[PDB]
Amino acid sequence: ALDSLALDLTLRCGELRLTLAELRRLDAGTILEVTGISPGHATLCHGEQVVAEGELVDVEGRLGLQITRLV
Amino acid sequence: ALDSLALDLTLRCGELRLTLAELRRLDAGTILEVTGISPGHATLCHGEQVVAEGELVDVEGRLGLQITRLVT
Amino acid sequence: PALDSLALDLTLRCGELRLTLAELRRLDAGTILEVTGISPGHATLCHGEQVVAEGELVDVEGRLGLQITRLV
Amino acid sequence: ALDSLALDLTLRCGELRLTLAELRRLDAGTILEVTGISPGHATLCHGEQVVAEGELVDVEGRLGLQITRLV
Numbered sequence A, D: 001a002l003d004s005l006a007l008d009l010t011l012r013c014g015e016l017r018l019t020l021a022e023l024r025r026l027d028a029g030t031i032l033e034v035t036g037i038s039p040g041h042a043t044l045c046h047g048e049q050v051v052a053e054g055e056l057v058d059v060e061g062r063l064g065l066q067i068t069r070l071v
Numbered sequence B: 001a002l003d004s005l006a007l008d009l010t011l012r013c014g015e016l017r018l019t020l021a022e023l024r025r026l027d028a029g030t031i032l033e034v035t036g037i038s039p040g041h042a043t044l045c046h047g048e049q050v051v052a053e054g055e056l057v058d059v060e061g062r063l064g065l066q067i068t069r070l071v072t
Numbered sequence C: 001p002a003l004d005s006l007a008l009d010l011t012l013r014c015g016e017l018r019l020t021l022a023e024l025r026r027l028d029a030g031t032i033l034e035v036t037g038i039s040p041g042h043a044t045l046c047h048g049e050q051v052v053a054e055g056e057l058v059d060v061e062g063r064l065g066l067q068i069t070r071l072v
Helices: A020-024 B020-025 C021-026 D020-024
Strands: A006-019 A031-034 A041-046 A049-059 A062-070 B006-019 B031-033 B041-046 B049-059 B062-070 C007-020 C032-034 C042-047 C050-060 C063-071 D006-019 D031-034 D041-046 D049-059 D062-070
Touching: A006 A020, A006 A031, A006 A049, A006 B062, A020 B006, A031 B049, A031 D031, A041 A062, A049 B031, A062 B006, B006 B020, B006 B031, B006 B049, B041 B062, B049 C050, C007 C021, C007 C032, C007 C050, C007 D020, C007 D062, C032 D049, C042 C063, C050 D031, C063 D006, D006 D020, D006 D031, D006 D049, D041 D062
Parallel strands: none
Antiparallel strands: A006 A041, A006 B006, A031 B062, A041 A049, A049 A062, A062 B031, B006 B041, B041 B049, B049 B062, C007 C042, C007 D006, C032 D062, C042 C050, C050 C063, C063 D031, D006 D041, D041 D049, D049 D062
């Protein structure tokens, strides 16, 4: 009777800090380096809490997340 | 001095909805369908708010975000 | 500001060297010339002969990138 | 004019266009993508005139330009 509770989850595929002044100054075409993550890796999140780890995969041209570890 | 505010940003590579039951049935190997983003793309987020859109790139093995648009 | 829209043709500069006309005449394929001004992996961003930024050369999926280390 | 004339040459290892507004807005740590060149390639220039092409080489820690084509 709560098993049916629907959770909005997001894929967190990197983390970084910028100052507000830095963020205001970003232009299209510039690349931000996002250290701390293996490229294509994503964490499955509810808000700030991690629920699962995964890899971004191609599914017939669509984006999929293949779960590698439940957390 | 507010320009000096350090913001914790995330790269968001999509979203999905799962019930508590589904989240409980979830195991290694399961492929979940992702919505809200074209593949190879990501948004730059402060909490739940988008501040930019971009494309994921590889920079000598490190992940990069090539900004395509600032949400301003 | 109207001058903000000014398109500048900037150059990546990977150092410099001085040759006499005789030397440049003698210069054949395969010769390695010593470079001054930068150490390997570095470049300046240049407008004409004016340095406007310094940075590091990176590879972006087979493309050249300049990672800015300082704006001048 | 004589063979003893000394030319100040530069290594051009890429070209790009930014507006002044874009250039004003650049921050340390951001990456600019420089299309139209193979990484490590450089042209040897007198002003805006190409006199040679080559590859950037590391020789015992020191930067060199290995000449591939004379112009």
